[PDB]
Amino acid sequence: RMAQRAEGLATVLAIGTAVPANCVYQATYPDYYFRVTKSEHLADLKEKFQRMCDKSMIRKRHMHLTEEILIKNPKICAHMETSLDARHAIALVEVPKLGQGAAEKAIKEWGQPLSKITHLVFCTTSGVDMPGADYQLTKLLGLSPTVKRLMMYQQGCFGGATVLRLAKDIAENNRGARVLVVCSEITAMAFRGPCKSHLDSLVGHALFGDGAAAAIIGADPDQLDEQPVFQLVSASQTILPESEGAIDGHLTEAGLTIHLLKDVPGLISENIEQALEDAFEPLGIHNWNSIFWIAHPGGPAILDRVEDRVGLDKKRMRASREVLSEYGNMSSASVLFVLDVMRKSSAKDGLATTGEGKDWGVLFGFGPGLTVETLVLHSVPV
Amino acid sequence: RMAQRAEGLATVLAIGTAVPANCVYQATYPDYYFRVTKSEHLADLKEKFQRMCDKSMIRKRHMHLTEEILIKNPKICAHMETSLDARHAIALVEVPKLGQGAAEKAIKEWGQPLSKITHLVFCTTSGVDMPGADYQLTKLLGLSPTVKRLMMYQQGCFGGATVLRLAKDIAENNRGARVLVVCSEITAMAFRGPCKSHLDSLVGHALFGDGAAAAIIGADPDQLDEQPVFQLVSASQTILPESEGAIDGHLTEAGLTIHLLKDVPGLISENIEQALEDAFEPLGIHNWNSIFWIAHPGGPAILDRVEDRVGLDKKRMRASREVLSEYGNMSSASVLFVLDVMRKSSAKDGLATTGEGKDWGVLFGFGPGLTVETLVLHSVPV
Ligand SMILES: CC(C)(COP(=O)(O)OP(=O)(O)OC[C@H]1O[C@@H](n2cnc3c(N)ncnc32)[C@H](O)[C@@H]1OP(=O)(O)O)[C@@H](O)C(=O)NCCC(=O)NCCS
Ligand SMILES: CC(C)(COP(=O)(O)OP(=O)(O)OC[C@H]1O[C@@H](n2cnc3c(N)ncnc32)[C@H](O)[C@@H]1OP(=O)(O)O)[C@@H](O)C(=O)NCCC(=O)NCCS
């Protein structure tokens, strides 16, 4: 036991990202969406969708699904037709392939041989299968057949926080472990035409985009060959009081359906200070403008309400809002994109640490429960 | 970091099991199965299914699905009709409820307050949903809202080994952590009528049953208040060479379909010696009759081929064969039932350890990949 284990904290050693090449601009999206679903006669519904997209603070999203694919799969354009098998035909191939794109970029930054990856954690909310995306990615990358795998399916938007919590315990308990974490999302599972009876589906179609992110996590980094980016200090999870049914998602004959209450930004903002105190009181930290912020960009209302309740300067949410602007809500992958934006912009602006010059940081994932996952991070010098 | 972590090995502190009350005897099952699926005109197929049931070495299985439920859900009785929503309506309720039955039993054996459970790992192969079964069980048991959860969906028959590997790293890396692990399986997702085009489906219908198992895992057991049952020494995982496509499962519009090659018992038995050497050579153990055996009872051919290739005395597989006889193949739950049978029959026969009087043991999970998971165990004195 005593020398089977690592000594130091789990550390992010590399981050990489990938998105589908196909880019949909938000400014023209209501026209596109109502045209390809043959729903232009639903004029009041289209005006509601236009207001949602104008308020989204999204400039563009990357989507694997193209009009050519929608023309070949018309049942996906209906609101609620039997379509799971046609959706799985796309997502069970594209989720591992997008993850491979991200993982290759992480592994290139890390610079170590594939044989040094001991563990793989793969997270998605886009389809399920056996063997899973973890097995498919093992095959695509040429990982060791002895790689220890964790397949995290149907996770939702806190999944990016969950894979870091998992990688922390693996990296710290196993000397020499190097964990590859990959989050990969393809919205072909959930895309459907609009309907007056499901206005919360319309909100999902204004926000959700595709993407994959990957990191290499290890404890006891090699002084010469590896370069720390962030340390993972602590990980917590809670179910919010009075939140039953706020965010539900069902995998059905008609694909993935989303059930989203208007109460979500309120429920999160009412409970976020208690999550901060629980994570930071043991470290003697109380000033929420003195830490860097990695907030899951679930939508602009969640970030606005948290900023207002906690009293943040507009700088604190900048990295989260840049990801929302350039990619939308990529479910489990989003927080790894925010970490990557933050460390790259910190170096580019000549700041002293990977966390915008701050030492301590917080990462928040939000999803069904309503669940809030809270990680404490430490930056490293630039 | 050095304050945050436990000292000793992750230990099983309690094990509990539960099955649906409804019991189907194997002797009469071909008549039942062909009658409730209205398939009596398929004479040749029924004779083939009779031979599979006679060779199964299964005396009975527990099944939530009853004839009354099958009468109300006729599309579940067809071979391949649209039926996922009807199957999910059963399994998304019954999986957490059967898990609750097992978890209550484990918690009673342990005797500590519910507030001492810090982590929950829930594994199933029977349906997916958001929030998941882990959330539903937290609600059913009244676990703390701060319980850190891992939801392991669409795992398959190595999932029982996987939750123990996860619990080992959590329990060892987190001082005071107590992990509730729960595996719960309901075959309503996969049950379907017979077809001459899918003989591997027929094999699934001869073998798979319903069941849930739970354990409490912790490191540094309290001298006065806790009593270890097994120690978790090491956990490995490998993909077998030349095994592509041996075991596939798809979640489709028609529910969960299984694709099973006749090659499976050969592939496992040809690679098991190497898995034993990898796990035990570092402990200086070479004699496979000197260790206790927890083998996933995937079917009688796997146990027979492993026993013959490795040269085991018939005593070694007794606990695995007893679980196969009394419950059939309960996917991810099966190995925890075997651990429970082994420790109970060891005490009843007055043996010196919970592992049939042996010090060291091996647990094997088998599933899609083809994946073999290998855990080294240590017994405790009786
Ligand atoms: C969608 C969003 C960008 C709109 O911005 P906003 O400042 O609230 O703008 P408004 O309040 O004017 O809302 C625009 C329209 O969206 C509708 N809307 C917003 N949230 C909705 C929901 N959950 N269900 C149904 N309609 C919703 C409003 O009713 C309004 O319809 P109307 O103009 O016909 O009355 C914003 O509400 C948001 O970020 N919410 C998402 C939070 C969330 O749940 N994200 C997590 C995803 S898991
Ligand atoms: C099915 C089983 C219980 C009985 O088979 P057995 O002891 O080999 O006896 P037999 O060879 O007479 O098998 C009976 C029939 O099963 C058929 N069968 C066995 N495995 C099969 C498979 N994977 N696909 C199709 N048919 C299969 C045989 O072809 C035979 O058909 P027949 O009687 O018309 O010739 C045994 O093969 C077994 O335990 N197999 C392991 C199944 C497995 O992979 N388990 C893990 C599932 S994850």
Residue numbers in the entry:
A (entry chain A), B (entry chain B): 10 to 391
What text appears in the publication on this structure?
Then, chalcone synthase (CHS) condenses one coumaroyl-CoA and three malonyl-CoA to form naringenin chalcone, which is subsequently converted to the (2S)-naringenin by chalcone isomerase (CHI). We determined the crystal structure of HvCHS in complex with CoA, CoA and naringenin, and CoA and eriodictyol.
The initial crystallization experiments with purified HvCHS yielded high-quality crystals that diffracted to 1.7 Å. All three HvCHS structures are highly congruent, even in residues lining the active site. Based on the electron density map, this loop appears to adopt two distinct conformations in all three crystal structures. However, while in the CoA-bound and the CoA/eriodictoyl-bound structures, the “in”-conformation has much higher occupancy and was therefore chosen for the final model, the “out”-conformation is dominant in the naringenin-bound structure. When mapping the active site residues known from the well-studied MsCHS enzyme, and our HvCHS structures, it becomes apparent that the residues in the substrate-binding channel and especially the cinnamoyl-binding pocket are highly conserved. The only differences are residue 199 in HvCHS, where the conserved threonine is replaced by an alanine, and residue 267 in HvCHS, where the conserved phenylalanine is replaced by an isoleucine.
